[PDB]
Design a protein around this ligand. Sequence first.
Ligand code: HEM
Ligand SMILES: O=C(O)c1[nH]c(C(=O)O)c(-c2c[nH]c3c(Cl)cccc23)c1-c1c[nH]c2c(Cl)cccc12
Length: 411
Amino acid sequence: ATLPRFDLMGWDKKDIADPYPVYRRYREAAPVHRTASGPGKPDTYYVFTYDDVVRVLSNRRLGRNARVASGDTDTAPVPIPTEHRALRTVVENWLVFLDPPHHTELRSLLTTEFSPSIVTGLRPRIAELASALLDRLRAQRRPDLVEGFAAPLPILVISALLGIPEEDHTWLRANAVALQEASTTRARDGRGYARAEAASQEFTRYFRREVDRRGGDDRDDLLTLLVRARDTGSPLSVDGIVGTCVHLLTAGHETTTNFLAKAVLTLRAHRDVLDELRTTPESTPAAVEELMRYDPPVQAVTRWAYEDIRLGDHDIPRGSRVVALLGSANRDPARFPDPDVLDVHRAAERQVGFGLGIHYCLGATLARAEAEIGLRALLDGIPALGRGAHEVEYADDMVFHGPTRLLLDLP
Ligand code: HEM
Ligand SMILES: O=C(O)c1[nH]c(C(=O)O)c(-c2c[nH]c3c(Cl)cccc23)c1-c1c[nH]c2c(Cl)cccc12
């Protein structure tokens, strides 16, 4: 061919921070790129166009279980190495890696807790949190927008939702990042799953203690809602409740964090727009839509073929692993003219940064509230947000994509 074998492993720092040119070349050669794996194994098909990505997350034929796909069984249900138990029992229990019917029942029991009406009555407390955070972060030496803002904001929001102390916000962040070392795009090199294993163990005990405490008080809070189901005839285990808690805690912030951080890098690289938001507050909602498609926090999601399927001009055999590049789709010229230009005026409801299909983002509404509000606080809270320079460090993560830390500078 012309361009080489494609995958998401082992990227250099500078391409992680700006992979769009990579997605562009490959996308221009072919909409799908097959990447074999060997002797009796499944190849991976990477989808780069918007239309194909939509089909992939739409198809009732692409599931989340590799072990269901292969008909094999010496195969893990979740992409977690068998030797690691705690880790593995917590990831198997994530709604995201679930297929109907189980997934349907769990999403339904959960979905009512993130309603537009609940989110609306939360906007005030989310605004108040963000402000107080910018206060502590301001009286500080070498402020880091991530650990000092983008990370604790959504953590405080989801933690109050679950029913756990805010005082643990830093402790929750640490373990979350440690656990995150298990996603498929990271190395397994030097200290692989090791840290993710210990992170899983701490969360299991931590949450186990919580659930064991339910029937003292009972407030409205996910933990109590869950344990209530189980005690009144609902079919779910502690391993189910525990994983669901970890799943929400992580799903509840790691994406919001990466979005907030990358939203700052984007605006600083587009001062005309950032200067627009500062002067015109109502533009925020529209801007959040663009910032979202321009540089989405989730660059890749995977599905598994449960029977043969034809995507693009390739036939994807039952058992294949399919990867939908959300970041590539969002910059597909076939659907977003001038994909590299930050244009807040283009029509919304097209960007797939929140996914699509039955696994669409459970807290999309909440997420969008934290983004609009959080961005606001930044725009109004840090006048020099777009001035001077900064220093950023991206993580070795192509799934949860975004800065590990983002430093700005003081007055
Ligand atoms: C701007 C921030 C956020 C972004 C960009 C985002 C993006 C996504 C994407 C792309 C998926 C699909 C994954 C797949 O198909 O494999 C997803 C799933 C999910 N997200 Fe969000 N998310 C965000 C915030 C949140 C928040 C704040 C919560 C907490 C309420 C949350 C909870 C979930 C859950 C539970 C799922 C799995 C749902 C299922 O499997 O049916 N997310 N998210
Ligand atoms: O590692 C992957 O390949 C992966 N793919 C997805 C996906 O959804 O397609 C995820 C994932 C888990 N939770 C998610 C949420 Cl809440 C949003 C978007 C993606 C994910 C993950 C993922 C994130 N963190 C993980 C950990 Cl810690 C273990 C195993 C998988 C993941």
